[PDB]
UniProtKB/Swiss-Prot annotation:
Its gene is located in the 5q region of the genome which is deleted in del(5q) interstitial deletion, a frequent deletion found in myeloid leukemias and myelodysplasias, suggesting that it may be a good candidate for the del(5q) tumor suppressor gene. The chain holds residues 1380 to 1717 of 1761 of the full protein. Ubiquitous. Highly expressed in placenta, skeletal muscle, kidney, heart and liver. Residues 121-340 form the JmjC domain. It comes from the Eukaryota. The gene is KDM3B. This is Lysine-specific demethylase 3B. It is found in: Nucleus.
């Protein structure tokens, strides 16, 4: 039967079921005030599916010049056509290959560039902004979004949204690599999974996705949702409370020193965006510093709400198109203030 909501992460994560329910705020606001992330399912059912396909991006924008990132080694592939990314999104026999002859795992960097999403793709901009959940928080002019109402004493977010496009990680060795490394933002954000590409035939890797979820830190209800099939899993997130950010910095300074890095005692390994917490490092964080996080699998149409100041990282299980909007809720405005 239909219900308003359910819990994941052993009761520590709110999951809202109806993205356009006018009463969502009554359930959301207490979890949000406590500094928790929140998940909202079903946003894909609200969107125009034909606007969010890889083949349409390639057809409309394919002659644009872009840079890619090789996720496995952070090498930059400079000044190639955006069709070279999109045509290999799902069809592995069309993907760029490294020197070893293997298909690469690529991220499309800064596309659309800077604040250009609305100008480059006005129909996509409308379809997304009209269907975002918790619209009093997330719309540019929502009553609980302070972004347009704050003086220069506050760091203000860029004009959005921003698109995040990358292939899925494939191999056992790939399990320890991030799509987006551990970092934090001084604004709140909502991140929507608008498309998941699961390759079939020549380069299918469904076995190692299932091994990754079964051997990892996800909850039993999350593990249930994977094994049911039915919905397409996109990306594995780890999110940490803003209050735990300095303990995470302490662990990463200690690990950097063990690995013979030479860093000043005050350097900020979260701001550097150079680390992915693999299973070893997540267990050490819990055992040695007493810090627990939230392990979240973002399926097609799931919106992840990330609180300002919360360290987070992302690992794509399959090829993903994500679209994210920054906002400034009153609950977390302290994180962007420029004094004390
Ligand atoms: C590999 N795989 N494929 C699926 C779906 C395909 C179409 C709907 S759901 C779910 C998983 N885990
Ligand atoms: Cl907070
Ligand atoms: Cl458009
Ligand atoms: Cl709302
Ligand atoms: Cl990154
Ligand atoms: Mn982020």
């Amino acid at each position: 039967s239909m219900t308003s909501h359910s819990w994941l992460c052993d009761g520590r994560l709110l999951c809202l079921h109806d993205p356009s329910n006018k009463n969502n705020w009554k359930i959301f606001r207490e979890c949000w005030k406590q500094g928790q992330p929140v998940l909202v399912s079903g946003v894909h059912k609200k969107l125009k599916s034909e606007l969010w396909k890889p083949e349409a991006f390639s057809q409309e924008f394919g002659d644009q010049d872009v840079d890619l990132v090789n996720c496995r080694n952070c090498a930059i592939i400079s000044d190639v056509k955006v069709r070279d990314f999109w045509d290999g999104f799902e069809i592995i026999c069309k993907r760029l290959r490294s020197e070893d002859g293997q298909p690469m795992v690529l991220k499309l960097k800064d596309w659309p560039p800077g604040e250009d999403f609305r100008d480059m793709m006005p129909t996509r901009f409308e379809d997304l902004m009209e269907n975002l959940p918790l619209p009093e928080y997330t719309k540019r002019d929502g009553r609980l979004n302070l972004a347009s109402r704050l003086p220069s004493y506050f760091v203000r977010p860029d004009l959005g949204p921003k698109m995040y496009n990358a292939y899925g990680l494939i191999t056992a060795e790939d399990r320890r690599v991030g799509t987006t490394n551990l970092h934090l933002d001084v604004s709140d954000a909502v991140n929507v999974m608008v498309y998941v590409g699961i390759p079939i035939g020549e380069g299918a890797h469904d076995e190692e996705v299932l091994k990754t979820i079964d051997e990892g830190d996800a909850d039993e209800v999350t593990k249930e949702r994977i094994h049911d099939h039915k919905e397409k899993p996109g990306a594995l997130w780890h999110i940490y409370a803003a209050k735990d950010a300095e303990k995470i910095r302490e662990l990463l300074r200690k690990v950097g020193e063990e690995q013979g890095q030479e860093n000043p005692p005050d350097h900020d390994p979260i701001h550097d965006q150079s680390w992915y917490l693999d299973q070893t490092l997540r267990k050490r964080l819990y055992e040695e510093y007493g810090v627990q996080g939230w392990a979240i699998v973002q399926f097609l149409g799931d919106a992840v709400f990330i609180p300002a100041g919360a360290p987070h990282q992302v690992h794509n299980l399959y090829s993903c198109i994500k679209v994210a909007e920054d906002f400034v809720s009153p609950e977390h405005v302290k994180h962007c203030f420029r004094l004390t």
